[PDB]
Design a protein around this ligand. Sequence first.
Ligand SMILES: [Cl-]
Ligand SMILES: [Cl-]
Ligand SMILES: [Cl-]
Ligand SMILES: [Cl-]
Ligand SMILES: [Cl-]
Ligand SMILES: [Cl-]
Ligand SMILES: [Cl-]
Ligand code: NA
Ligand code: NA
Ligand code: NA
Ligand code: NA
Ligand code: NA
Ligand code: NA
Lengths: 311, 311, 311, 311, 311
Amino acid sequence: VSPPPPIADEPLTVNTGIYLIACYSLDDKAETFKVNAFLSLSWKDRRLAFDPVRSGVRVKTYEPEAIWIPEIRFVNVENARDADVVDISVSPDGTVQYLERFSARVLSPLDFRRYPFDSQTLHIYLIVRSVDTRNIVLAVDLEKVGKNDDVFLTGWDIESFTAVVKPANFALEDRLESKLDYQLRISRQYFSYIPNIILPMLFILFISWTAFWSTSYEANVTLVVSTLIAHIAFNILVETNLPKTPYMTYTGAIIFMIYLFYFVAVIEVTVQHYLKVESQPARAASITRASRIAFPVVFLLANIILAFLFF
Amino acid sequence: VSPPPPIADEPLTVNTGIYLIACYSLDDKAETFKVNAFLSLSWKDRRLAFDPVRSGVRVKTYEPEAIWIPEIRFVNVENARDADVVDISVSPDGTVQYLERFSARVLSPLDFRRYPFDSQTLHIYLIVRSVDTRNIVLAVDLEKVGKNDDVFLTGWDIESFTAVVKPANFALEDRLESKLDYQLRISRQYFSYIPNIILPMLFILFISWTAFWSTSYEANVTLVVSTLIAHIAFNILVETNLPKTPYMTYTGAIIFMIYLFYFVAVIEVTVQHYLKVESQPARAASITRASRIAFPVVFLLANIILAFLFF
Amino acid sequence: VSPPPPIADEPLTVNTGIYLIACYSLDDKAETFKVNAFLSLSWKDRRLAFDPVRSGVRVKTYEPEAIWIPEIRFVNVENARDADVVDISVSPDGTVQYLERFSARVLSPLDFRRYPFDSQTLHIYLIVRSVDTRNIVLAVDLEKVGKNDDVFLTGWDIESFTAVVKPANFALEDRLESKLDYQLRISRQYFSYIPNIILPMLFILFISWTAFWSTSYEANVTLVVSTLIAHIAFNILVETNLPKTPYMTYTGAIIFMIYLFYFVAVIEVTVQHYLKVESQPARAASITRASRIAFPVVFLLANIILAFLFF
Amino acid sequence: VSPPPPIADEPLTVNTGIYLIACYSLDDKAETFKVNAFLSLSWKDRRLAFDPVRSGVRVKTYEPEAIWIPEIRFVNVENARDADVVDISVSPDGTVQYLERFSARVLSPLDFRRYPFDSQTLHIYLIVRSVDTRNIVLAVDLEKVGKNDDVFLTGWDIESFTAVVKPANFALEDRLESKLDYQLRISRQYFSYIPNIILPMLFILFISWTAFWSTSYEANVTLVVSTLIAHIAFNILVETNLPKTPYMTYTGAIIFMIYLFYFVAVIEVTVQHYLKVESQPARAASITRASRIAFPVVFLLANIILAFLFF
Amino acid sequence: VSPPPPIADEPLTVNTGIYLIACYSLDDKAETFKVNAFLSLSWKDRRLAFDPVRSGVRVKTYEPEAIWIPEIRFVNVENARDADVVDISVSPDGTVQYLERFSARVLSPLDFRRYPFDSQTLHIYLIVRSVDTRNIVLAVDLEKVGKNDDVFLTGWDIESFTAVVKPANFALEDRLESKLDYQLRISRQYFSYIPNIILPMLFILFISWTAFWSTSYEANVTLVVSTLIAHIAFNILVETNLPKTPYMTYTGAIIFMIYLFYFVAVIEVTVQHYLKVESQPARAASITRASRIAFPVVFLLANIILAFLFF
Ligand SMILES: [Cl-]
Ligand SMILES: [Cl-]
Ligand SMILES: [Cl-]
Ligand SMILES: [Cl-]
Ligand SMILES: [Cl-]
Ligand SMILES: [Cl-]
Ligand SMILES: [Cl-]
Ligand code: NA
Ligand code: NA
Ligand code: NA
Ligand code: NA
Ligand code: NA
Ligand code: NA
């Protein structure tokens, strides 16, 4: 079966629509998400037209095999989509109305710079390759683009699901290709990160700073070193939930900076002890007293600077 | 093959039933479960009717290909169900009796607020899309809804398996859809959490409080800091078995609150030491003596408040 | 193709046999195992009978498609078995001899109460649904039930592979079902648990008890707290290799009890120190001296009691 | 299609050959490996013979469906091999030359006793079941057994790939079976284990022994206990990369033995302290001085004994 | 369908091209990557030639089944590629233009010697087996080799995608094989390793060296031992992201060397203490003072030597 012939030298417009049934498994490390949706296709094949008076019926139902159907593929899917045809309905004028239900693992890049306070734009790219007979162009039937209310993406808030109505038409291997951009705007549910990572991380840091109210070198060494190890544990926990970015993430920046605080706390703890042994506890006292104000102020200011830089 | 024609303008009623054979793999993080069950379908196709006298036979067995079968799909499945037709039996009035055995990974949201003392309602949504010829409506044959005695969901107690008999009939992409809700009520086996997480977590906390019967700053620092790290280990262990909730879970709340107890224990340990060095051990004694009663009382009361709030 | 017609009102007896080729992947957490075996089926279809004189041949070989084959399924499999027909041989009297080679992931519940000294009974349930024409009943041909010598289940000893010869005949969705129980008796190879978990766990506990021969509070605090953490590490290691049981396991019981030993060791260490500071080292000495005998005796006795309760 | 008829009462000899294209994923815990290879089969079917003069052609190419092909299966595969027929070429005398490209996950037991200095013999078992018409026997065409130069098994050295030319002929379910043993001899690349596990493990042990040059009980307790915990971490790391063996492995033996060294080091550290407090530092000095020589000598000798026992 | 017949004794040239659509999942441990690309094939089949005047059409479109298509396979794929034919276009001269869209998990060895500053050459090997009728040779149509702009490999920079135009023609199982090498040059994004592993690892090492400004044996033991454990944690973290190499990697070398620094730091800490107790603090002072300069200088120089050796 060959494509529909043109009235004039016009391209064939295949109207599309994606209706999300189930959206799930957003893998941060793999930068993938799984989708379960309806794909609707509609084009005019004049060869399939009929008189509703003569035939008796108002629409004709065909099996995929029977008629010409455009080869619509997804660009950013890992493997070819699992698709099952729901219905093919031809109107008297030859306006075909195809509907299929699919499921696919979509590969869409994620921006972790503001993690865990980040928002993402997931993409679903519909594509059609033009045939030697005639050129095929994609369109968006906005009436058939949407999502079920039930649709939930665990640990994410679904903002919108829209399509960029004008396709990206380009040449590939000397043939015209019509690409469409279906955008799923989501924003992360940062809540859990606060009692699980952020606050525990701040508590161990504040515990380290109690060394500024202690003259006991042995106790200070225990305080700063122990807490530093809990900080390493938290850094490792965080980097396991994330991929390797060629940029600093917000949480990454905070975590990195906190190492410097531990490093300087050890230096202070060392300096204070050296001075004490050197029979200069008056100078050590001045440094320790300063550190009590210096450490939280420089911490608070450094954080303002980063939130500023990052947001 | 087209759908059965209507006597009058009535919709076609497809009677359904799910009988669970094997239920397994309830993933808390992924909010999914795997099912292995029988799906039974029954509808009237007058075109398939016959005389049992003339034909000799009391029922006719058809291969799926031979006759019209309604396109029944599952809403909340990740990929299309693995189904194998067991039997198709036509009675002479044309009452088709379809049976298939399926397996599917069902995506059903979970409520972790009362974890590990939570109970859940797992869902299985049967759906049918109406055709251009006629409208299809789902029904529940209660005689064919159930589960095998053998059926066990590891670490969960299976309460019930029922169907909401009246379908959710709604329009989707200008066509009628009949949705059915099969509900599997389960409740978690919280037992193991007690000797594995809850009690070990309480023992390390109580060990931290022995610092209230010690004047040794160096020992107290070791006691409180060490136990705090074991608490971090337990917090991490717990959050690995769970997804990121935009709400506090019961265990999450207990765990978070316990950080504050470690924080204040460090403050006490610090205050007591500062006072001792400042040659005011009488005041430090008062604080330490108070802490011995204050810490367990405020702990016990805070827990009453949370269990109250959570249950 | 319809089932064989009955001589009288007798049911059709399908003789079965499972011969294990490869048995592997026993998942303790998932309570599953993978099997690779031969399935043999034999029944009498009088319609397929022939005279060996006239035909010349002593048995006829058919392709599955050509003849009626009973729909034998497995109850406790996650997904439908991957089966490839090896041979179908019909004798002159119409005694069909079907053989297929299959592989399946079988879901069989496990009893962890005596872990790692436990023994299990893995099950393989063959089932047949009776047709409207006639009732089908399963039988066991003991001569075709067995396992290859080569068959090895890693970290387990294979005791036996037998079938419960009398089937469980019951009604399901108003039709007769013949269920057969193939039992694979295995017992765990507990050896490795001894040098990897049990003895290391006992060594850290015994190290904690050296605090009973020390007057140094700071050293005792380090001894008991450090070892307690290694005990937490071992508890976590153990519970990662196991599912969440609504009952205590033998190892679970030992592990839990050992927390109480650490708790009381801290109490002793605390009491001894308090008394020393209170200028009462004579009383502290009595307690410490007692603890040296009390701790191992109460440990040894508590263990006798548990092994007694558990075995 | 029936098997080739015999000239006399001889069995049908199917000549075999496996040529490895890609060998990968040797799972130590699962005792499996994945293979991608060519399978070549050759037998004489007199029915397919032809005159090259009359026909014109020197060999005839058939589609698998067209002719009789022996049912060759693999014994030790988890699931049935993914096979794609490359070519079927019939010579004038009726000598069929089948070639297929397959991929399979082969289950072959591993011996960990000498780990990580172990060598293994991976197996690939070809098998054929005799038919009622005639008996089928496997043979090895050595000219068609081999492996590509490119073939690499990560972290392993491939020694050889040979076939045991005489098949294991035996009865199974009253039918003759011809089994062939394809052996892939490999030996582990132990290199990485030295700077990653062995030496780090020895360094922490030697650090523990510095307690023999210290009179500070508190320091010794820290030294021995800390290092013991790093040893526990290394023991856990090792046992995660390995399955549960009913025997001791070389690394397992070394690791276990090192626990005894930590245990006795604690005993020494305890004894030395008790004696010091008891105002007997002369006796404690003797013990400590001895321990300095005793610990490395008994360590070195114990290791000679084990390497001796193990190799 | 047989292959195209030769004009003279020339081989059939199948022109090839791979156009990468989506490149993803580069597994360092498994040494695999997943690809989603277009495969284009073009050869001359004179039997399919036609007059464009008589036929009317300028190119003819065939279904794969209708015509002879060369059996092109991939050498280094784990399983056979998931391929879906996009188009088959025959020109009047019989120049076939095949296009398919595929996805495959490619197995390509990785060189970790310079990790995480390494660059790799991923391979895709196209292969064709010659038939008994005629020999088949692969060619590269450079105009149909490329990659989409969108193509991103997470944590890697894609340098180039080229094909080695002259095929590797060799005999395999007495038949000619034409192998082509498609090379994807990539280089790792080392950025993240710096704030996540390299700098944290250096901070803990520098913290250990503060023991050179302390006379407190108990504090030094805590400092060096604690930091050593954090170093073990980092070593383990690193070796989990990598496979077991029979060679030293750059990061592996740095990590290993740092153990020696901890070992010698313990020795110094021990020596200094022994001397102090021995009432020789003047000699201990000299050693400690030297260590303050020796440790960073020997560290810095050792690192120059390694970067030199490695790059
Ligand atoms: Cl697609
Ligand atoms: Cl363009
Ligand atoms: Cl074009
Ligand atoms: Cl479905
Ligand atoms: Cl089954
Ligand atoms: Cl096989
Ligand atoms: Cl391939
Ligand atoms: Na079509
Ligand atoms: Na149908
Ligand atoms: Na059949
Ligand atoms: Na300490
Ligand atoms: Na055949
Ligand atoms: Na073809």
